[PDB]
Amino acid sequence: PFITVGQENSTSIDLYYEDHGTGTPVVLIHGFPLSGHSWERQSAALLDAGARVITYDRRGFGQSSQPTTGYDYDTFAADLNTVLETLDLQDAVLVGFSMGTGEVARYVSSYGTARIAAVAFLASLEPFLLKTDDNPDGAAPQEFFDGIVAAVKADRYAFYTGFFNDFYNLDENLGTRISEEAVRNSWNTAASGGFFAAAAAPTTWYTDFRADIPRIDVPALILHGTGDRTLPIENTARVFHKALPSAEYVEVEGAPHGLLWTHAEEVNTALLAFLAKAQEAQKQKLLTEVETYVLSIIPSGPLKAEIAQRLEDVFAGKNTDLEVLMEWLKTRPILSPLTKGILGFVFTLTVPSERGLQRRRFVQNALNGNGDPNNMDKAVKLYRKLKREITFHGAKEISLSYSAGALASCMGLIYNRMGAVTTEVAFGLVCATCEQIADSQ
Amino acid sequence: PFITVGQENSTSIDLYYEDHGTGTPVVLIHGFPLSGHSWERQSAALLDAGARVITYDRRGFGQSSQPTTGYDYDTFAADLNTVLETLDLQDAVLVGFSMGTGEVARYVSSYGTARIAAVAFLASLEPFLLKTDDNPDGAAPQEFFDGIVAAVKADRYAFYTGFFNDFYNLDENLGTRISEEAVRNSWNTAASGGFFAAAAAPTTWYTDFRADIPRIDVPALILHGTGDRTLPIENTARVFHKALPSAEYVEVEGAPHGLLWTHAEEVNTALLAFLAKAQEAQKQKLLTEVETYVLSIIPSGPLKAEIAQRLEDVFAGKNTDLEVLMEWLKTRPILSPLTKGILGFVFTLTVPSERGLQRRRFVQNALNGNGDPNNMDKAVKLYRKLKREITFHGAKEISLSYSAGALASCMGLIYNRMGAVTTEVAFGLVCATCEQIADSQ
Amino acid sequence: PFITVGQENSTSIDLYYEDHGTGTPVVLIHGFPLSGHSWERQSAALLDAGARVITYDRRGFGQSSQPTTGYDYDTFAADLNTVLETLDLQDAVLVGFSMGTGEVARYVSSYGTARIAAVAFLASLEPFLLKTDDNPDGAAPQEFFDGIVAAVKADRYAFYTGFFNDFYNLDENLGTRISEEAVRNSWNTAASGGFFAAAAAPTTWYTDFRADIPRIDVPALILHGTGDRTLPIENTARVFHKALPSAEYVEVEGAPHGLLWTHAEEVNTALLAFLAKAQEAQKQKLLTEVETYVLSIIPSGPLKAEIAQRLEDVFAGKNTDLEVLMEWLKTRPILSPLTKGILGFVFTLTVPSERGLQRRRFVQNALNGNGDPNNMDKAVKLYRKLKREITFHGAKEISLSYSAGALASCMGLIYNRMGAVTTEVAFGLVCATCEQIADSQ
Amino acid sequence: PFITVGQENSTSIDLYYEDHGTGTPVVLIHGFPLSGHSWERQSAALLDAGARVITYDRRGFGQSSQPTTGYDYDTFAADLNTVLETLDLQDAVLVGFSMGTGEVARYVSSYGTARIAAVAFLASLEPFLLKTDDNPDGAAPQEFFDGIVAAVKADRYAFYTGFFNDFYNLDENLGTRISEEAVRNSWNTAASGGFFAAAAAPTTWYTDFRADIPRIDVPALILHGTGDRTLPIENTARVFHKALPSAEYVEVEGAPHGLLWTHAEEVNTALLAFLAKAQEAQKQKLLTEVETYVLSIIPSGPLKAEIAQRLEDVFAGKNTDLEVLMEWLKTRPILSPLTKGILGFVFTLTVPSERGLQRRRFVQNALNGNGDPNNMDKAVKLYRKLKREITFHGAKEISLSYSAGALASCMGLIYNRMGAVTTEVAFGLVCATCEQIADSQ
């Protein structure tokens, strides 16, 4: 798969990307000189843990186009921007490794955290690698980087070999934490990047990210290997944490630069924990928003108390007997049959286990759009559009452009499994409906 | 990026290509069994020297499609034709290495040199490799080539190994001029070409190019390694130069077949020397053409003598005091303010150094399209199109479709730096303007 | 030229008007029985002094329609209203002579001073001409005016003769301050007004303007001839100044009623003195307003202090070395290149002398709309509309309907002299831009 | 009637014009400070002699608008251009008197003689009135003109009096060649021009017309009064004739500047002669063009000889017996009935006297469009458009856009007097028809 990010002469500039799983989106931004596939140990864990995994190959690397332009962090951040906008990612986690940590800082800094729930920096460049008068903690002098450029231009093929040596601490880790075959694959991946990008990349490494850091808005993780020969932990992660005290901070004891493979565990467990903390809060946010919309249609009173208590309990995960819940709703006075259908729908959708219970007649009758063909026609039209939605707000926005009869019919269509959409999209549908109905009062 | 060159059964035949830099187009045609990426040492130099670099992968190789049809030099030349026409290349240099030198000869021969400024043959097949009665200087008998085909069909993978041995003179050059890793990359590239192309390619090697050579119209370079084990310099470059005495001719002392890598600097230097001469000639042509258009609007007389002398001098590179030049123009009688603005524009554009001189009021006033909004509207439209142009003639052609008022306004727009285009495109703009104005007289 | 002010039976009622020069609008309202052309000595001076001169012929006079309705000051003031609204006059000076001074008072009184910067009363009717019990200072009894009406109805032609006698003090001024031919022209003008208007006009002369005077809001001038036989200075200008002490007050020694011609230089000088003060105040206001908009985009701090000081100084007329000013701006830290371009533009526009300095590259680059063709397209569209504007607010209003990119491009267009607009219109453009940019923050 | 020539602030600039008679257009351009009505003695003669008379009032004079802009010969010539284009005048005579002679020279010079058959200069400004070093024959120094401006600004009313004195040589001509009443009317006309134009006009009088004169392409007349006190014949007409030897040249013995009235006879007789010479040639041109179109449809042979002889004779004015002519045509073999109808039409149209002969059945039958309703429908449509045409080429151009059936039907419509058009328009119709028919062969 490709996303086009620009044009170079007669050719467009396309980034290779992958898009796996379902759930909260996690975007992984690889390091030099590798590709999105270098995250494969992390991707597997995130997929098992229930996240949507997005990887892409930076321009000049892996399967992306290989221009001779745009090798700088503003372009790289603009590239990332295009990806996020193209996929309409909401509530995303951005995880960068090495070079990738430059994208994370520069994007957050320039474009803000509108789509972004949390960030993570692994084997970071930050805050500035260039050793100057005003930057004493810098890791190396300018002449040092000039050196790498010269070395890559001389042979890049040979260069990759010595690079992966220190990248992986092969003198320590070969035959132990990394196989000879895994290293061979890495070299092949590097050899496959563009010649121009290979020599141009090292010039972006001493980008000054010092003014980007105060812009970091959302929860952050900083993770570094203490045996990092490529980015000395003392000039990078340790001074970065002083600049962002707020960041959660993890040192991987004796881990090299290429800790994604050698210490995938410690990485994946820690990354997993970070996702886990981010994910539950996001889920809670989703649950409570739904609740306000659902409650907005119910008349104020003690019933509205019983209903809200029940929502909150199933939302907290207390598996309730849906059969008991549904009978209660069914037999509630005052509530309109429409209202009971909406609640009926919400509860079956959110309850931990449906326990093989059949659909309820009172709900099917409540959500049938009065069996009106125009309602049903529009509901089918909305359904088509909702299949393309992946977020709560996108779903809710498109739904609000339809009449309440059509919305109720659409809900029946999903309820009865005549169509299927993602959970968060279904929430947006029922919330648009509640919004429309509440507004009629 | 791809260019489609044909159809095979249900599939189209697409050639992988790249398009880097800006300036005079240089098209690099790779050898067997490698791809456009084998030129990476040359590409870097050409890019630094300020050329537009085009590479593509021959059908059956690198990232191009892998048909089982069209393995012959007429098809290969037709493939090249499609590339050149698709990109609308003007004033291009064609550089072939090994197999690629067959494309260069056959295209020039059949399609002529309309788009082509110069040609270069590196490690050439020419003039005929087959040793016959009528071709005594041929390098080998037919049975020898029949042998290679049989060897590739037997194992191609194993075959590439012994091939790169002699291709690179690895017994001499390994660890010295070529690394083991660079060789590994080459084998990977070869292993990635199509099985059918691998066995079919060697049949095209003894194509008789003897009738193609007299067709070579434009300046040429012949370059060969004297240690070439693959194409014996005595049966190829040395008899080729006798057939084309006119060619500039360079022997690389003890260089193998794969001299692009092993002797890449020297090869790159040679390319610069040829590109540098071709570029200088092209620049001189551009100065000469621009000049005729510019002179066409001036009334015949002694002033027209002073003006032409001045153009020629700045065009020759005599850095003149633009401030002095501009005052002179400004104060010239007879010349219309329009004419003075056009000349004003040309001189600031072509003078070696502007010496931080501010724009001139007499020119801004002359090139303002009479402050007419429709002129300015069209000038902005033209500007958009000119941003996409890279050649003098393409620019001039599109410009001539606009009125003189709009053209003058566009020139003011560039003059005043409200927009930017490449130099040759700017020349096309001012020349279209002169052409339109001259035609009004 | 005509402005339609009403309908009489099958015919519309149209006022003849003229509209000359550029600059601050000055509206001249003639006396009985003459037309807008009676101001010709004043018009010439005002035109030379750099004002926009508007004249019109009151209904029933000169080249206006000659209805038999609407001969009263409310209608006359409504007529004037229609003129001012039709032309969208802003910041106008209203100058009335004789009858015209009734329009000035009644319009200001009823419609307010929204469009009006200053007023002038020459040979005024004010405050009330009718001699009554409650108006002891009145110039004549009712029976006296009844007399004039009767005289005009008897012969108006013969009547004009004796009228111009006292109107001009011909016994004193003929052959001296007024020629016989100038008097002949006056009679011809009068003979050309409508018969009905001639007899109906004198009934409007004893209109009580006593309640209109407290409504005079803006700076005023009262000017009267001490030899006025038509409107005794003692019953008119002298008691009017007591009612409006605030008015600037000028007696023309031995000047008759028709002092516009006989003492035209002195009257013209007086107009220049008032126009000159009003113009200077208006200019100061413009400097003050422009300044707030310009300052609104600059970050608060010491630089903002240096900038404001400089604006104020050039605005006060301290001719500053623009070259020095521009270098300072150019080299200022913190300020965005956009901001520097806007300031660059403002300073070159307001500095007393540009001293033949060329345009600055930093400004041209700052105001180029990013060389975007859509910006430039809209900027050209805006420019067309701005050519039709004559006021700061009209310009600013139309400009605010365009995006900031298009506005910046338009400014570059003017800066680079690719188009031209009046100064106040240019101010409106740069102020709309500042407003748009400030609002983005 | 008005023609709009521009815009001043909120008002358009309209020129008052008149358009009298039918025949060859003669455009009269008045002098300072008078209007188109000053030509009334000439207009009457030209109308009696059978010409179309066009007069207009220069901006600032007579009944034209009175702007404070555009008082210069390029604007005045542009004004004239607009008039000629607005009325689509073809084959026009331009006659200027005094100031008007500046329009004639400047228009011819800049716009060329495309619409213009002949020119006439009466009491000319030419070639340059300013007395300089390079212009020794100039009539006065710059300080002299500066003087007139100052005098007009001082009083223009009084000024006109002394001006008409010398304008008319009233000391010689009053009560003799000009009445006191005629002079009174002149002053009234002048007093009615705009104040601004009166003072601005004299600045245009020393315009250098020396480079305009070589541009005079067409037959010219120069006419001057030897008693001209306003434009000394020695600095104007006499040096002008040296610059244009080719001009027909007439001195009116002891005639003043205002010779149009005082010597209308000598003027009108001479002008009449000039028109008479121009008119006959134009008529001959019209006759011979018609003939080629008419002959183009006839087969080559002796009949074509008889026909051509006859056309030429009636065209030369030999009144022929149309009855005899028509019978001859009617009874001619070979000629198609269509052809006979066309000739029938032409002859009745061009014959001096029809002698009360009834329309011919053979022609009515020939020109009936086959009684086809679509033909007739289009013919009626064409007729509507032809009523708006006044020239041969305009008529012929619009006619050629119709089919031959429709054209023939239209001709029948005119032939049968069911509609009426001017002679030259009718010629264009029959010529378009002949052109269409000839093209079918």
mmCIF file of C-alpha atoms in Angstrom, chain B residues 332-416:
data_model
loop_
_atom_site.group_PDB
_atom_site.id
_atom_site.type_symbol
_atom_site.label_atom_id
_atom_site.label_comp_id
_atom_site.label_asym_id
_atom_site.label_seq_id
_atom_site.Cartn_x
_atom_site.Cartn_y
_atom_site.Cartn_z
ATOM 1 C CA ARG B 332 18.862 54.867 -24.232
ATOM 2 C CA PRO B 333 16.796 56.906 -26.702
ATOM 3 C CA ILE B 334 14.628 55.269 -29.448
ATOM 4 C CA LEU B 335 14.069 52.008 -27.469
ATOM 5 C CA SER B 336 10.501 51.594 -26.249
ATOM 6 C CA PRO B 337 9.989 51.277 -22.475
ATOM 7 C CA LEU B 338 8.693 47.758 -23.180
ATOM 8 C CA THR B 339 11.855 46.857 -25.069
ATOM 9 C CA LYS B 340 14.005 48.328 -22.269
ATOM 10 C CA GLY B 341 12.129 46.239 -19.704
ATOM 11 C CA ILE B 342 12.688 43.031 -21.676
ATOM 12 C CA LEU B 343 16.388 43.793 -22.003
ATOM 13 C CA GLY B 344 16.475 44.833 -18.363
ATOM 14 C CA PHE B 345 15.027 41.450 -17.445
ATOM 15 C CA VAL B 346 17.390 39.498 -19.698
ATOM 16 C CA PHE B 347 20.530 41.224 -18.376
ATOM 17 C CA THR B 348 19.724 40.769 -14.670
ATOM 18 C CA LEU B 349 18.956 37.127 -15.461
ATOM 19 C CA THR B 350 22.183 36.422 -17.392
ATOM 20 C CA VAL B 351 24.736 38.684 -15.687
ATOM 21 C CA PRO B 352 27.203 36.614 -13.603
ATOM 22 C CA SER B 353 26.666 38.649 -10.411
ATOM 23 C CA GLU B 354 23.775 40.999 -9.599
ATOM 24 C CA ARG B 355 25.983 42.431 -6.816
ATOM 25 C CA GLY B 356 22.983 42.853 -4.500
ATOM 26 C CA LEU B 357 21.423 45.472 -6.793
ATOM 27 C CA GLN B 358 17.806 46.221 -6.182
ATOM 28 C CA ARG B 359 15.228 45.754 -8.906
ATOM 29 C CA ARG B 360 14.863 48.712 -11.287
ATOM 30 C CA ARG B 361 11.746 50.900 -11.324
ATOM 31 C CA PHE B 362 11.947 51.344 -15.123
ATOM 32 C CA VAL B 363 11.714 47.550 -15.530
ATOM 33 C CA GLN B 364 8.952 47.046 -12.948
ATOM 34 C CA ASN B 365 6.941 49.750 -14.704
ATOM 35 C CA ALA B 366 7.709 48.260 -18.145
ATOM 36 C CA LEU B 367 6.694 44.690 -17.181
ATOM 37 C CA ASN B 368 3.490 45.401 -15.223
ATOM 38 C CA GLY B 369 0.966 44.402 -17.946
ATOM 39 C CA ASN B 370 -0.431 47.963 -17.734
ATOM 40 C CA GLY B 371 -1.697 46.962 -14.306
ATOM 41 C CA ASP B 372 -4.562 45.250 -16.116
ATOM 42 C CA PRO B 373 -6.252 42.523 -13.973
ATOM 43 C CA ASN B 374 -7.056 40.206 -16.925
ATOM 44 C CA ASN B 375 -3.429 40.322 -18.069
ATOM 45 C CA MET B 376 -2.326 39.600 -14.531
ATOM 46 C CA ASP B 377 -4.925 36.817 -14.185
ATOM 47 C CA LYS B 378 -3.588 35.062 -17.302
ATOM 48 C CA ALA B 379 0.028 35.688 -16.251
ATOM 49 C CA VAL B 380 -0.648 33.867 -13.010
ATOM 50 C CA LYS B 381 -2.246 31.015 -14.971
ATOM 51 C CA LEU B 382 0.786 30.814 -17.265
ATOM 52 C CA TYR B 383 3.117 30.901 -14.244
ATOM 53 C CA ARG B 384 1.396 27.790 -12.812
ATOM 54 C CA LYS B 385 2.059 25.910 -16.059
ATOM 55 C CA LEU B 386 5.653 27.203 -16.314
ATOM 56 C CA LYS B 387 6.419 25.785 -12.843
ATOM 57 C CA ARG B 388 5.855 22.361 -14.429
ATOM 58 C CA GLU B 389 8.146 23.038 -17.400
ATOM 59 C CA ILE B 390 11.834 22.119 -17.445
ATOM 60 C CA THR B 391 12.821 22.985 -21.036
ATOM 61 C CA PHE B 392 13.191 26.117 -23.108
ATOM 62 C CA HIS B 393 10.948 24.906 -25.957
ATOM 63 C CA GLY B 394 8.191 23.522 -23.700
ATOM 64 C CA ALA B 395 8.132 26.825 -21.879
ATOM 65 C CA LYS B 396 8.208 28.853 -25.086
ATOM 66 C CA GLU B 397 5.432 26.729 -26.654
ATOM 67 C CA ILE B 398 2.986 27.134 -23.770
ATOM 68 C CA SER B 399 3.867 30.849 -23.450
ATOM 69 C CA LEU B 400 3.011 31.606 -27.109
ATOM 70 C CA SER B 401 -0.605 30.614 -26.354
ATOM 71 C CA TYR B 402 -0.920 33.758 -24.189
ATOM 72 C CA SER B 403 -1.326 37.398 -25.259
ATOM 73 C CA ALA B 404 1.638 39.820 -25.090
ATOM 74 C CA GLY B 405 0.093 41.813 -22.185
ATOM 75 C CA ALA B 406 -0.211 38.617 -20.130
ATOM 76 C CA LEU B 407 3.300 37.517 -21.113
ATOM 77 C CA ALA B 408 4.810 40.882 -20.079
ATOM 78 C CA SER B 409 2.921 40.707 -16.800
ATOM 79 C CA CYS B 410 4.207 37.167 -16.211
ATOM 80 C CA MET B 411 7.772 38.386 -16.811
ATOM 81 C CA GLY B 412 7.229 41.153 -14.262
ATOM 82 C CA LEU B 413 5.946 38.535 -11.839
ATOM 83 C CA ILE B 414 9.194 36.562 -12.162
ATOM 84 C CA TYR B 415 11.326 39.724 -12.281
ATOM 85 C CA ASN B 416 9.806 40.903 -9.017
#
